[PDB]
Design an enzyme around this catalytic site. Structure first.
Site, PDB file in Angstrom:
ATOM      1  N   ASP A  11      12.019  -0.973  -1.478  1.00 15.55           N
ATOM      2  CA  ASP A  11      11.543  -2.273  -1.928  1.00 15.55           C
ATOM      3  C   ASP A  11      12.378  -2.731  -3.115  1.00 15.55           C
ATOM      4  O   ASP A  11      12.967  -1.914  -3.828  1.00 15.55           O
ATOM      5  CB  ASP A  11      10.055  -2.255  -2.315  1.00 15.55           C
ATOM      6  CG  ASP A  11       9.629  -1.002  -3.085  1.00 15.55           C
ATOM      7  OD1 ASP A  11      10.197   0.093  -2.900  1.00 15.55           O
ATOM      8  OD2 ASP A  11       8.690  -1.125  -3.899  1.00 15.55           O
ATOM      9  N   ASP A  65       5.940   2.130  -2.779  1.00  9.25           N
ATOM     10  CA  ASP A  65       4.976   2.287  -3.855  1.00  9.25           C
ATOM     11  C   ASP A  65       3.956   1.162  -3.772  1.00  9.25           C
ATOM     12  O   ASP A  65       4.311  -0.017  -3.697  1.00  9.25           O
ATOM     13  CB  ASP A  65       5.658   2.283  -5.233  1.00  9.25           C
ATOM     14  CG  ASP A  65       4.684   2.019  -6.368  1.00  9.25           C
ATOM     15  OD1 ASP A  65       3.569   2.580  -6.343  1.00  9.25           O
ATOM     16  OD2 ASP A  65       5.036   1.252  -7.289  1.00  9.25           O
ATOM     17  N   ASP A  92       0.941   0.599   0.904  1.00 10.85           N
ATOM     18  CA  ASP A  92       2.045   1.379   1.439  1.00 10.85           C
ATOM     19  C   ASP A  92       1.612   2.760   1.916  1.00 10.85           C
ATOM     20  O   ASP A  92       2.469   3.613   2.158  1.00 10.85           O
ATOM     21  CB  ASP A  92       3.152   1.517   0.390  1.00 10.85           C
ATOM     22  CG  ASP A  92       3.890   0.216   0.145  1.00 10.85           C
ATOM     23  OD1 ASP A  92       3.730  -0.721   0.955  1.00 10.85           O
ATOM     24  OD2 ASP A  92       4.631   0.132  -0.856  1.00 10.85           O
TER      25      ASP A  92
END
Ligand SMILES: CCCCC/C=C/C/C=C/C/C=C/C/C=C/CCCC(=O)O[C@@H](COC(=O)CCCCCCCCCCCCCCCCC)COP(=O)(O)O[C@@H]1[C@H](O)[C@H](O)[C@@H](OP(=O)(O)O)[C@H](OP(=O)(O)O)[C@H]1O
Ligand SMILES: Nc1ncnc2c1ncn2[C@@H]1O[C@H](COP(=O)(O)OP(=O)(O)NP(=O)(O)O)[C@@H](O)[C@H]1O
Ligand SMILES: [Ca+2]
Ligand SMILES: [Mg+2]
Length: 933
Positions: free
Chosen positions: A345, A666, A670
């Site tokens: 991400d 995170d 997730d």
């Protein structure tokens, strides 16, 4: 009484809800029993809660110990190779008593050195993993370590918080909790005072927020009911059993050959009649044969391989802990070596997550730098600071650094903090504005959420007037505004042509520069005709845009080099982010994930779901097989859209090679994807407990570069095992051949039992410690990821084994046959039973030991590397092991006499043996030249 109330919470139904309405009133009805600080905060005195909680009980109490040291040793004693070794030692000791004992002692000296060390590891690692593993307590500023939890606390529950203890619901907004951990149902239970106020420990909060005091926090609840009442390993085991079977076959053949030779010679050939008085002497010979076979088995069995694997894994984990990686699953150390894809991400990992304002479009003039307060026209600066201060939610603040004049810390969400920093940079202060209206006259607030991507605030402070600010995302709010405030406080009509023109002129450059566009507006309502705030569509329109701001989060200094290393080592990096496509692409270009000119594909989540789904609502993997090969950037991603990607990569058969993915996810949502990935990293500093609980490895510094380390070390582990297989596998070849030849010719087995057991100690036990603690090198990041069908014995390893075996066999046989003439030291062949040791065989034994010692040095380079001596001193155990073995060999040869079947040797023979040993390094340099193919 302390646990009676728990019975109520055991109901888990409408019966429990009606029970409180029967006699228990509400939570406040019975909270009177204790202080519990209902609407106040705890003063924090040291002997505070002694009176209320007379008996003190904490769920922090762990089990005493999973195992004790004695139990650990007993557990480590049960291994197949160790069982074989123990049986052989028992047989040897039994047959000897009928210095015959010493042989058995040698075997035991191995077994102990195999078990104790292993036990020690299982005693230390198990401790450390237990040692590693601010609280939900709420008040004024009350934040205390997580490890106490007491009755009567005021727990504030937010979305994604893991409930540390059971409780009862007081107030909040739309609290939805997943209770699959206790009920087995993955449906989101909606909690409310009237319907379901029960909250349970171990459940994960999915949506909403609220407050909680206590139902009954302790181990006496349902939480304590349960408490009170590897491909590499498999391949290594298969290799070990194959080696054991081969060694057993060779030992049986050797024993049969020796026995048949002796029987044929003594009876058939010489025609000797069998006499009873000769029966004792005969069986002596038989015993001397039998033990030889046992020794061969003890040589052939690879008892050091499990030890090497254990040592390599433990050392790699303990050194990874230094590199900001906390390993919770041991096997994840190895799997990360074969990773071929990394899904990460954007926010947090690749970006520093510190958002500051760089560009603004105030006063119809674009400023690439923060303008002077004099340049901006009057009555616009005041409106801007007022709007920003009011919309800052009153919880975010720019706290002073107070640490060596560092950057000021940001507590709340980063966008509001960036806007506040812009206000401060304009030499304006928002504190008096906030103090003027500290939620005293705040009429209505529209809370920010990911759907609207905006938040609106209603102020009734003006006399019979309504003002709404409603900052937005520059793509929803901007199109809704119908006028624009420009020039010297001039409101002019905003037309769609002006909208698209200003978009193309101004908004696109910020997005292409990597910035995020945020729009600030305001709108005034007439007097008080009607409070038509019920509908949001008709109220969030006709705004007037004040200014447009570009907020940027700087990329980490070291992530470009890390991404370059990852892409060089055959690992492809993909980025999943919730930002718009332009900003995501601009940031990925700077990160180096997607090169400027290429055929890489970046698409949004909506078209992702539309394209990967053929007609009807089903999702087909055949469609996903087209998107994932060249999908680099995903923008506006839904929380679940990452999972759909990861699965699509893992369960893909179109590619010839299988894929191993690592997801650096995170966040609370997730959870599924983190479990689907082979190795799931979780951010440490800002990671919620939900994500950290389901993670394999935790990154303490929440940085992408550390992930590269998790590659290197992992690959290192493989290499270490490989080099051990390079050493052991040659020695147990040469000896097995040599003794076998000694069975056919000279009927003597040149190396005696004790000498072969010393070689076994050299090559099996000590070699694991020597070659299993090699520090890693960065060059390991210069090869393609290894497949999971790759043979455990590579071509170069077998080439080295065969070359060194050929050299050793040639030298040993030439010595054994012609050493009488070469050294003029007489002949030791065909020696009678119970005869003094000869120098000729001592020379052979010493030469064998020296050649193995130098083969240990030159066997550290699996990949055909010429410079063997590269980085020897970086390992402080290898040198000491080799030197200690050399010293022990010297003292055994010289001072050790009849028990070890060795005679004193003069200096000349010692020097010649050392020269023959250096011949091993010379031959290794020679054999390095020959091409493998
Ligand atoms: C090394 O080069 O090790 C020596 C060990 O010597 C002794 O330890 C004692 C025996 C004395 C040998 C000789 C003379 C020979 O033993 P090995 O032949 O069993 O060792 C491997 C291993 O077993 C692989 O796993 C197999 O490869 P795969 O699984 O594909 O079949 C294949 O063995 P195989 O083909 O017979 O099954 C060999 O490469
Ligand atoms: N305080 C705020 N008020 C109004 N709009 C906001 C605010 N904060 C963010 N936004 C906007 O609304 C979006 C909400 O998405 P958000 O999850 O906050 O960030 P993201 O960058 O889109 N996703 P992510 O990278 O996972 O953090 C942002 O992208 C902004 O465009
Ligand atoms: Ca062995
Ligand atoms: Mg999002």
């Amino acid at each position: 009484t302390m646990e009676e109330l728990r019975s109520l919470m055991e109901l888990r139904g409408t019966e429990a809800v009606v029970k409180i309405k029967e006699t228990y009133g509400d939570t406040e009805a019975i909270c009177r029993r204790l202080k519990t600080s209902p609407v106040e905060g705890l003063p924090g005195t040291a002997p505070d809660l002694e009176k209320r909680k007379q008996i003190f009980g904490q769920n922090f109490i762990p089990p005493k110990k999973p195992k004790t040291f004695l139990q650990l040793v007993w557990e480590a004693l049960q291994d197949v190779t160790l069982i074989i070794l123990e049986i052989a030692a028992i047989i040897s000791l039994g047959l000897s008593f009928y210095a015959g004992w010493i042989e058995g002692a040698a075997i035991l000296l191995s077994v102990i050195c195999v078990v104790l060390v292993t036990a020690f590891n299982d005693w230390s690692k198990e401790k450390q993993f237990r040692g590693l593993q601010t609280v939900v307590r709420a008040g004024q500023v009350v934040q205390i370590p997580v490890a106490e939890i007491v009755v009567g606390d005021i727990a504030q529950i937010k979305y994604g918080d893991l409930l540390p203890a059971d409780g009862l619901f007081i107030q909040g907004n739309d609290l939805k909790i997943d209770e699959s951990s206790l009920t087995g149902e993955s449906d989101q239970v909606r909690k409310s005072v009237d319907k379901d106020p029960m909250l349970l420990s171990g459940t994960h909060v999915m949506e909403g927020s609220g407050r909680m005091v206590v139902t009954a926090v302790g181990v006496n609840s349902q939480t304590g009911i349960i408490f009170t009442l590897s491909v590499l390993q498999g391949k290594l085991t298969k290799l070990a059993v194959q080696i054991g079977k081969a060694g057993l076959v060779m030992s049986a053949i050797t024993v049969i050959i020796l026995v048949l030779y002796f029987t044929v010679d003594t009876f058939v050939v010489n025609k000797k009649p069998w006499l009873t008085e000769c029966t004792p002497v005969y069986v002596q010979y038989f015993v001397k044969f039998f033990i030889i076979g046992v020794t061969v088995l003890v040589v052939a069995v690879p008892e050091g391989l499990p030890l090497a694997v254990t040592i390599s894994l433990a050392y790699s984990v303990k050194k990874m802990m230094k590199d900001n990686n906390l390993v919770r699953h041991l096997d994840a150390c190895e799997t990360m070596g074969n990773a071929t894809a990394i899904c990460s991400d954007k926010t947090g990992t690749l970006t520093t997550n510190r958002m500051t304002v760089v560009q603004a479009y105030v006063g119809d003039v674009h400023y690439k730098e923060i303008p002077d307060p004099s340049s901006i026209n009057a009555k616009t600066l005041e409106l801007l600071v007022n709007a920003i201060a009011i919309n800052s939610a009153y919880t975010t603040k720019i706290l002073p650094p107070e640490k060596e004049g560092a950057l000021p810390r940001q507590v709340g969400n980063k966008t509001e903090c960036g806007l506040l920093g812009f206000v401060l940079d304009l030499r304006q202060d928002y504190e008096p504005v906030r103090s003027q209206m500290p939620e005293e006259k705040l009429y209505k607030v529209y809370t920010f959420n990911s759907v609207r991507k905006s938040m609106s605030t209603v102020i009734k402070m003006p006399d019979e007037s309504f003002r709404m600010y409603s900052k937005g995302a520059s793509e929803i709010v901007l199109k809704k505004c119908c006028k624009i405030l420009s020039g010297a406080g001039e409101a002019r009509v905003f037309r769609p042509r002006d909208r698209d023109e200003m978009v193309k002129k101004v908004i696109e450059p910020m997005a292409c520069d990597g910035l995020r566009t945020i729009c600030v507006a305001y709108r005034d309502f007439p007097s008080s005709p009607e409070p038509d705030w019920d509908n949001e569509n008709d109220i969030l329109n006709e705004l007037t845009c004040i200014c447009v701001v570009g907020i940027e989060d700087p990329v980490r200094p070291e992530v470009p080099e890390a991404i370059r290393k990852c892409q060089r080592a055959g690992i492809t990096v993909r980025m999943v982010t919730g930002d718009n496509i332009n900003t995501a692409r601009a940031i990925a270009i700077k990160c180096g994930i997607i090169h400027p000119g290429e055929d890489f594909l970046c698409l949004e989540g909506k078209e992702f779901n539309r394209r990967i789904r053929n007609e009807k609502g089903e999702i087909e993997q055949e469609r996903i097989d087209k998107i994932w090969p060249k999908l680099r950037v995903l923008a506006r991603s839904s929380p679940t859209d990452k999972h759909t990607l990861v699965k699509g990569i893992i369960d893909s058969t179109h590619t010839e090679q299988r894929q191993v993915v690592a997801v650096t996810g995170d966040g609370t949502n997730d959870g599924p994807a983190l479990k689907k990935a082979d190795v799931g990293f979780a951010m440490g500093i800002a990671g919620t407990d939900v994500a950290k609980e389901a993670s394999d490895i935790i990154l303490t510094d929440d940085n992408f570069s550390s992930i590269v380390k998790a590659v290197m070390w992992g690959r290192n582990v493989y290499d270490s095992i490989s080099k051990f297989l390079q050493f052991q596998l040659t020695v147990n070849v040469v000896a097995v051949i040599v003794a076998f030849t000694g069975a056919c010719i000279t009927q003597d087995s040149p190396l005696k039992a004790v000498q072969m057991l010393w070689v076994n100690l050299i090559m099996d036990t000590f070699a694991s410690l020597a070659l299993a603690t090699e520090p890693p090198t960065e060059t390991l990041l210069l090869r393609k990821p290894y497949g999971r069908n790759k043979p455990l014995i590579s071509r170069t390893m077998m080439k080295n084994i065969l070359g060194h075996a050929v050299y050793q066999l040639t030298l040993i046989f030439t010595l054994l046959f012609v050493g009488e003439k070469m050294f003029q030291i007489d002949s030791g062949r065909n020696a009678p039973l119970h005869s003094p040791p000869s120098e000729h065989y001592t020379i052979i034994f010493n030469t064998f030991v020296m050649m193995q010692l130098f083969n240990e040095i030159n066997a550290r380079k699996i990949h055909g590397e010429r410079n063997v001596f590269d980085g020897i001193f970086r390992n402080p155990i290898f040198c000491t092991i080799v030197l200690g073995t050399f010293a022990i060999q010297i003292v055994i040869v010289q001072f050790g006499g009849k028990p070890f079947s060795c005679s004193p040797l003069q200096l000349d023979q010692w020097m010649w043996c050392i020269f023959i040993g250096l011949g091993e390094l010379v031959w290794g340099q020679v054999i390095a030249t020959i091409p493998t193919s």
